């Protein structure tokens, strides 16, 4: 069935060296959603440093080729910063809210969190409010992240996946999340 998915990525000059690995991850996750279309899957994207950067809304395009180029051209230019909290809030207010561009009513909304560093500041309040508004929150913790942080948010439990390494550990986590996304519709 139809689904509105918005991915949240940590993107700075500090983790620019992992951009290609993350791109391949996102490609698999976008594939997991099935055909893109106004009556099918939609994808939005926001990145975060200390500040949030919405890159494109759910209805920016249904052309898979264009969407993947946008992902390819994600700016990794910002200074150091890992403010996931404000990112969640911004993605909610401007990309997944009922009034957001391309957001479809009676369609499940999903917020997918990519994390690769220990989290600073409050994430509990933004995530809880996203859940309360009816959004499904999922998180992929990449190598470098603290795997316990997004597991101890007690708000409803999150579907968490942790890459214990950048190899098979990563592959398993991504596959598990891909299955989880397929079921979210
Ligand atoms: O350039 C094209 O031929 C088609 N565009 C549209 C998609 C792409 O460039 O990937
Ligand atoms: Mg083209
Ligand atoms: Mg950083």
Author numbering: 1052 to 1205, 1208 to 1238
Task: Give passages from the manuscript.
In addition, a new interaction site for laminin‐332 was identified and characterized. These data provide new insights into vWFA2 functions in the extracellular matrix.
